[PDB]
Structure 1
Amino acid sequence: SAIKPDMKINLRMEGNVNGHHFVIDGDGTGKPFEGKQSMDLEVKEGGPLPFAFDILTTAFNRVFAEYPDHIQDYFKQSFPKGYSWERSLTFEDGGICIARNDITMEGDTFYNKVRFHGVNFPANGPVMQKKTLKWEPSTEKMYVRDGVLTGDITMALLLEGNAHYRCDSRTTYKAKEKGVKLPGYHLVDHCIEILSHDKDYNKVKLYEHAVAHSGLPDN
């Protein structure tokens, strides 16, 4: 009842990768029921960012995800009060990130409080060298663990030069209100895209498409 077909979103991410502090302001629109959202982002300090913007992109709301009827939608059922997610990103070269987002809503807008942190990215690695092109599309596996909805994902960044950079992520989602029903095992296909940006990535426009499904042969 609370979510509408078209909603706004405000976002304030703050973080540190490799000792580098940054703030990023975001403002955007999207269709929760179509699994879509875009948003305009602007680094407000920390720019020029010394690292690849790509590592940030998954960390700027699953509520924007096309859920089919045979699958419980934890995220759209979390609102008004909202929900929180925490995430770790484990890169194949030792680079490790942790993140959190408190997602809230009032009126037509979703509010996202997001903290990002990253450690141990190697000097001549693709992240500090900015050799990343984009996230390749993948599929997140959703399941319950310790009484909590958990998502594991097998993720890859395309690099300059016809090779890929592995990332492995675990997310833990918690609805704020008591009583929200945990879903069964499902899978969530997603694509993420930087549609436009300036040369140093101080201002970027980002797009996310997400759809949930029960996998083969039901997808």
Structure 2
Amino acid sequence: VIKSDMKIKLRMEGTVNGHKFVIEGEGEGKPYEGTQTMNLKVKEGAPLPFAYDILTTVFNRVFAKYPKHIPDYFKQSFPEGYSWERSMTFEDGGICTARNDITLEGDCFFNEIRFDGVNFPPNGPVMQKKTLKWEPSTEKMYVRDGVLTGDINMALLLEGGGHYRCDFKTTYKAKKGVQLPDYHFVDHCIEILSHDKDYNNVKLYEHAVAHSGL
């Protein structure tokens, strides 16, 4: 059962620009307020040679405030749960694929995550670590072949002001039948609360609220 306070555990294995890494995270959140925080620790591949920000949005749409009038694809899916797949296409040709298989055991969400990144330019903001944060965003959610897709126009703020664009397309797949939502939106804001020098340690917060637009 999904309570008002829930715990998060995760392990991400991945490779960006040939660099292998493993990251583990523990935290907690409030599913009905659409908030969560976690602490993340690089287990292998430190120091990461790329912008930590490309990972952060991979680190669960259960953590979203859903109003009564929009069916909540994520909450309805448990105890069985759900998985997602995502591509991230950056404007200079960097591409990431990502996935998360989310299970519930007691009061804790377990997150098995793969992340893979290719074709980032050597002098781009990713490989030179010139990103500051992701701007807030609005994810456009709709049903396509019986599952939920979310598309997002994401943007990283860069050093010197200036933006670097990435398009997300995520497919969310419930492991049981649930009532499918009509087209709707989820506003997102995501923030690195703290970190140490090489991002070996990172405290990371998210707020998500689902809505119907104007």
Please classify the TM superposition score into its range, dividing by the shorter chain length.
over 0.9
Q: Does 1:7 align with 2:3?
A: no
Aligned to 2:97: 98
Distance 1:156 1:207 in 2: 17
Aligned to 2:179: 181
Distance 1:117 1:32 in 2: 28
- The letter for the 2-side match of 1:171 is T
Deviation at 1:144, TM superposition (A): 0.9
Aligned to 1:65: 64
User: TM-score with structure 2 length normalisation?
Assistant: 0.99
Number of equivalences: 214
User: Which aligned runs of 4 or more in structure 1 are off by greater than 4 angstroms?
Assistant: none
Deviation at 1:127, TM superposition (A): 0.1
Aligned to 2:194: 196
Deviation at 1:182, TM superposition (A): 1.4
Aligned to 1:119: 118
Q: For 1:160-171, what aligned pairs fall within 5 Å after superposition? A: 160-171=159-170
Sequence identity, in percent? Answer: 82
Distance 1:14 1:205 in 2: 19
Deviation at 1:82, TM superposition (A): 0.8
Name the SS for the 2:79 alignment partner.
coil
In terms of mean alpha carbon deviation, does 116-125 or 142-151 score higher? Answer: 142-151
Root mean square deviation, CA, Å = 0.5
Aligned to 2:15: 16
User: TM-score with structure 1 length normalisation?
Assistant: 0.97
- The letter for the 2-side match of 1:107 is G
Deviation at 1:146, TM superposition (A): 2.0
Name the SS for the 1:99 alignment partner.
strand
- The letter for the 2-side match of 1:144 is V
Distance 1:127 1:204 in 2: 17
- The letter for the 1-side match of 2:198 is D
Which blocks of at least 5 consecutive residues in structure 2 are unaligned? none
- The letter for the 2-side match of 1:104 is T
Contact 2:147–2:174 at 8 Å: present in 1 too?
A: no
